[PDB]
């Protein structure tokens, strides 16, 4: 259940070893993300965080492609992963939904947190923002979702 190898934790299933190196390259990078590389500026700080979120996304995307696309692993290996926190159950579940296939996070679809209305501009297709931009001819001022670093979760882009 915990990430740790605590004695209660059941040993790995069969297909594990083949993918262990690919996962380790993620782990060793997260070590480097939280090492507290100091920065004075705010922008740089929440950039540092954006690193972590994106890494987490990439890992869970890797596993999701293994089980729900290529079916390159067993069900038992999968469930054993989820129980060991190598993946994000809820996030994957959003990916299986129709509209969310490329999604950032689970914050970005939070309706409650955001002030009015909801769902970061992070979720709005570039196709449109270019159009409302076109009305103003000011181009478009959006770059990164402050929570994530996303640019266009929306699954068209």
């Amino acid at each position: 259940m915990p990430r740790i190898k605590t004695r209660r934790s059941k040993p790995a299933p069969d297909g594990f070893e083949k993918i262990k190196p690919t996962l380790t390259d993620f782990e060793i990078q997260l070590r480097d993300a939280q090492k507290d590389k100091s920065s004075k500026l705010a922008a740089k700080s929440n950039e540092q965080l954006w690193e972590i979120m994106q890494l987490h996304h990439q890992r869970s995307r890797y596993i999701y492609t293994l089980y729900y696309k290529r079916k390159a692993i067993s069900k038992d290996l999968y469930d054993w992963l989820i129980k060991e926190k190598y993946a994000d159950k809820l996030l994957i579940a959003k990916w299986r939904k129709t509209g969310y296939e490329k999604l950032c996070c689970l914050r970005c679809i939070q309706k409650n947190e955001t002030n009015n209305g909801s769902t970061c501009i992070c979720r709005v297709p570039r196709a449109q923002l270019e159009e409302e931009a076109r009305k103003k001819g000011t181009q478009v001022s959006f770059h990164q979702c402050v929570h994530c670093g996303c640019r266009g979760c929306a699954s068209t882009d």
């Binding site: 570039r126 196709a127 996303c150 882009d157």
Partner: peptide, 23 residues
């Protein structure tokens, strides 16, 4: 807009999905 237009259009972004930078 059209599906071909979108499919072609996206690869423009530098780095896959979705952190890949437009421009």
């Amino acid at each position: 807009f059209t599906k071909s237009e979108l499919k072609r259009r996206r690869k423009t972004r530098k780095g896959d999905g979705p952190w890949g930078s437009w421009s």
